[PDB]
Scaffold this active site. Structure first.
Site, PDB file in Angstrom:
ATOM      1  N   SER B 119      49.601  50.569  18.843  1.00 48.49           N
ATOM      2  CA  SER B 119      50.052  51.484  19.884  1.00 48.49           C
ATOM      3  C   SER B 119      49.444  51.031  21.203  1.00 48.49           C
ATOM      4  O   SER B 119      48.216  50.980  21.338  1.00 48.49           O
ATOM      5  CB  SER B 119      49.645  52.923  19.569  1.00 48.49           C
ATOM      6  OG  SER B 119      49.921  53.782  20.660  1.00 48.49           O
ATOM      7  N   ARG B 120      50.298  50.705  22.173  1.00 47.36           N
ATOM      8  CA  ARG B 120      49.806  50.177  23.439  1.00 47.36           C
ATOM      9  C   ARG B 120      49.383  51.270  24.408  1.00 47.36           C
ATOM     10  O   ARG B 120      48.583  51.000  25.310  1.00 47.36           O
ATOM     11  CB  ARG B 120      50.866  49.279  24.073  1.00 47.36           C
ATOM     12  CG  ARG B 120      50.318  48.330  25.124  1.00 47.36           C
ATOM     13  CD  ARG B 120      51.241  47.142  25.301  1.00 47.36           C
ATOM     14  NE  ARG B 120      51.225  46.294  24.113  1.00 47.36           N
ATOM     15  CZ  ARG B 120      52.256  46.094  23.300  1.00 47.36           C
ATOM     16  NH1 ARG B 120      53.423  46.690  23.494  1.00 47.36           N
ATOM     17  NH2 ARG B 120      52.110  45.279  22.258  1.00 47.36           N
TER      18      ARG B 120
END
Lengths: 256, 254, 236, 124
Positions: B119-120
């Site tokens: 998850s960025r």
């Protein structure tokens, strides 16, 4: 298999080869000291031999490796020793080493009456062996046994070993032998020579374990190579197939 | 969904799935005789999925604070993420949840590959209490993924390395979940707290599923105010951490 | 089949052998119709061609249709767009595998690629679901230990992993079954097994009751009763 | 002149290429000598950018490496040796370098004189 799965398995095989190479290096490092110790203990047994040769219920003693990856020699020798000793399968067994404990299942596994651990963490020596044997004598009356069988691997070859076992016996084994005329001294012998034979068997077992590992881990690393080769061949054949399909795609793209 | 977004409401849009959309657009483009590209996809499929996905947004307070969240689904063929559409969508999106069949058949369901999943946005999107307790979880699972592969090779190992297996196996077991049974974060925080801090080390690996079933029933029945605080405030104060530890050790005593 | 469904008001079985040939024919005529080929050479209309056919086979409120479709897999490539597209439509899929028939296993169904939406504790019950999950987990563990076994041999696995591998091999052989139709060329009389017997047998095997029996006794027998009988015959 | 020594150099480099891969467990005396030779020679195979060496200067260095003379030097100093050696050859043995240039062959006289020079410097 699909290219992705082929890559996954090939990486797994390559990693296994690397790990086995590292263990091979460790075994080859230990080998020199192991062999020298085994030779030294075999020579040192001559002091007790000089008397034992002239003088001439059941129990079980197991002395094997503390951990696996010793090839088949370490566990198989102890298993064969238990199978041969199965003439008295109910003998109380004192077990040293995990592999010997497992091989004890060749005889009745419930015969266990004593245990030891940590044999593989250090080179064979009498320093802790004496204390362990004293605890064994206290707990099992080993000093009066008519026949207690202690089995250890014999390093018969530079890279091979065979099962071996010897009976420890009470003082009466020497004091009662008719040949004793060639010479409680008998009990002092049943202690000192018992410990000496235990150490000699321990050193022989350690040398056999290290030689067997040095041979078998290298054999494992070599075996990895053939399957890696064939999987590389399959991987490159798949690469050729996908390349052909890509060429087909761009050719059909150009033509219209 | 953009009506909800633009009227200050919140929307979650799931596309199941964008690969079939790309196939349909490839059909249209080839029957129109537009020039093919890679895998006979037309040249602007990236433009397609990009102008689709870029519509997910969080609007400013001036614009109404509305938001639209996108969960595009993508079906890889034999795990080949190198394909055209998987590459484009992975490039466009802000992260990925990666599902693997080998995990599925090892009994690890819902089969999320914790290593590949990224998850960025990251911890900024996480609830504060779960952010607090789950701090070390990623580290322990990262260690486990390596040490388990080492251990299966058959090498003996020191106790310090063994501890990594002890917690990693039980954490991997702890993240298992049954279908259609989502857990409130109120209920998730205690489980992660117990798992990470080593309280589960004394539980047989096969019985972990019972613990997660029973422990919450204990907390709901005997420590309900702690759960109420975790839910209402969403963050763990020192006192809540102390109470949670007390309850966890009280239950683990069994 | 649709006429039987809609207007006779009947339950219908609709076997199709082999629906890959429909897509293959569509591909064969595709180029002559002037279409630009796609992918590995299939027609652009592949997806909608499959859709307009498959969505007709559906059950409806007027009648029930049970459809069994044999699907070819060219060059054993399950990633080929034809079977890959077909997967999206089916409710229950069983994948026959060359690599398993190469072991002499028949029907050679791959137990780690067959899947059905009914394998659900709400549908099959908890016992069935647990037995199936444990079977698949054991087989997957054995598959994951294949390479380590090939390198080091069985002598170097942990006791737990060694037991898992042995039980996995016995389970894998026990999944085989002689069909009556195959009596002609297998030479083994056909067997038919209840679902209850299947679940109970695999539960018993997983519980370790029958772990003393040789692997060879589980091959192509039928139920666990046949396992015991064949163990007796092999021992004699 | 360069051939005469490089043909021998090839053999030592191949032997090291085998032995080092084998050893990467104490080394047998011959293998230890092979390792010493191989790494001492590798220190000559290394060269600085934009620093080409004439044949007159390559021949003596490869000569000292082939005949095992520079095995008397710790490898971490060979470079400092290699340059100074050449300077010594420029001062005390100019005739040898000039003959290598002019004739291009290690005649028995020149070869023995080069051996003497290498011994002299290695002792120095």
């Amino acid at each position: 298999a699909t290219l992705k799965e082929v890559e996954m398995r090939l990486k797994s095989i390559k990693n296994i080869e690397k790990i086995t190479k590292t263990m091979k290096i460790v075994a080859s490092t230990r080998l020199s000291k192991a062999e020298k110790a085994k030779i030294s203990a075999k020579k040192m047994d001559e002091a007790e031999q000089l008397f034992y040769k002239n003088a001439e219920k059941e129990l079980i003693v197991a002395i094997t490796s503390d951990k696996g990856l010793c090839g088949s020699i370490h566990s198989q020798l102890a298993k064969a020793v238990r199978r041969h000793l199965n003439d008295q399968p109910n003998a109380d067994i004192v077990t040293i080493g995990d592999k010997i404990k497992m091989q004890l299942l060749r005889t009745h596994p419930n015969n266990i009456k004593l245990s030891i651990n940590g044999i593989g963490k250090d080179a064979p020596t009498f320093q802790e062996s004496a204390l362990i044997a004293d605890k064994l004598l206290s707990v099992m009356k080993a000093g009066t046994y008519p026949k207690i069988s202690i089995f250890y691997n014999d390093p018969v070859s530079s890279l091979s070993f065979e099962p071996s076992e010897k009976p420890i016996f009470n003082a009466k084994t020497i004091e009662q032998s008719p040949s004793f005329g060639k010479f409680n001294v008998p009990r002092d012998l049943f202690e000192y020579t018992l410990a000496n034979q235990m150490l000699t068997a321990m050193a022989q077992g350690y040398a056999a374990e290290i030689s067997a590992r040095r041979n078998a881990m290298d054999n494992a690393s070599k075996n990895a190579g053939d399957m890696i080769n064939r999987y590389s061949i399959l991987y490159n054949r798949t690469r050729q197939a996908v390349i052909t399909n890509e060429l087909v795609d761009i050719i059909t793209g150009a033509s219209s | 969904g953009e009506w909800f977004r633009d009227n200050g409401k919140h929307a979650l849009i799931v596309y199941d799935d964008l690969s079939k959309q790309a196939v349909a657009y490839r059909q249209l483009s080839l029957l129109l005789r537009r020039p093919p590209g890679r895998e006979a996809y037309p040249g602007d499929v990236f433009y397609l999925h990009s102008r689709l996905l870029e519509r997910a947004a969080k609007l400013s307070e001036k614009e109404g604070s509305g938001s639209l969240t996108a969960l595009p689904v993508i079906e890889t063929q034999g795990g080949d993420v190198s394909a055209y559409i998987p590459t484009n969508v992975i490039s466009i999106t802000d992260g990925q949840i990666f599902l693997e069949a080998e995990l599925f058949y090892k009994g690890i369901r819902p089969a999320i590959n914790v290593g590949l999943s990224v998850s960025r946005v990251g911890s900024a999107a996480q609830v504060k209490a779960l952010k607090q307790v789950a701090g070390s979880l990623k580290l322990f699972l990262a260690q486990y993924r390596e040490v388990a592969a080492f251990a299966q090779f058959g090498s003996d190992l020191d106790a310090s390395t063994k501890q990594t297996l002890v917690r990693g196996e039980r954490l991997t077991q702890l993240l298992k979940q049954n279908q259609y049974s989502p857990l409130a974060t109120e209920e998730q925080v205690p489980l992660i707290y117990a798992g990470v801090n080593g309280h589960l080390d004394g539980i047989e690996l096969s019985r972990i599923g019972e613990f997660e079933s029973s422990f919450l029933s204990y907390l709901k029945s005997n420590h309900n105010e702690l759960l109420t605080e975790i839910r209402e405030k969403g963050e763990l104060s020192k006192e809540l951490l102390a109470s949670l530890k007390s309850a966890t050790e009280s239950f683990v005593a069994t | 089949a649709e006429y039987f469904r809609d207007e006779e008001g009947q339950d219908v079985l609709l076997f199709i052998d082999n629906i890959f040939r429909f897509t293959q024919a569509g591909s064969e005529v595709s180029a002559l119709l002037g279409r630009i080929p796609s992918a590995v050479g299939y027609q652009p209309t592949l997806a909608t061609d499959m859709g307009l056919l498959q969505e007709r086979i559906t059950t409806t409120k007027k009648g029930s249709v049970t459809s069994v479709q044999a699907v070819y897999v060219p060059a054993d490539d399950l990633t080929d767009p034809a079977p890959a597209t077909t997967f999206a439509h089916l409710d229950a899929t069983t994948v026959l595998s060359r690599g398993i028939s190469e072991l002499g296993i028949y029907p050679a169904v791959d137990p780690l690629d067959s899947k059905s939406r009914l394998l659900d504790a709400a549908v099959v019950g908890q016992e069935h679901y647990d037995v199936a999950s444990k079977v698949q987990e054991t087989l997957q563990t054995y598959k994951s230990l294949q390479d380590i076994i090939a390198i080091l041999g069985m002598d170097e696995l942990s006791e737990q992993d060694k037991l898992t591998v042995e039980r996995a091999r016995k389970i894998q052989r026990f999944l085989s079954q002689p069909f009556a139709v195959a009596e002609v060329f297998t030479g083994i009389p056909g067997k038919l097994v209840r679902l209850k017997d299947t679940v109970a047998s695999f539960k018993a095997v997983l519980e370790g009751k029958y772990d003393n029996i040789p692997e060879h006794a589980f091959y192509m027998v039928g139920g666990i009763e046949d396992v015991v009988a064949k163990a007796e015959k092999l021992a004699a």
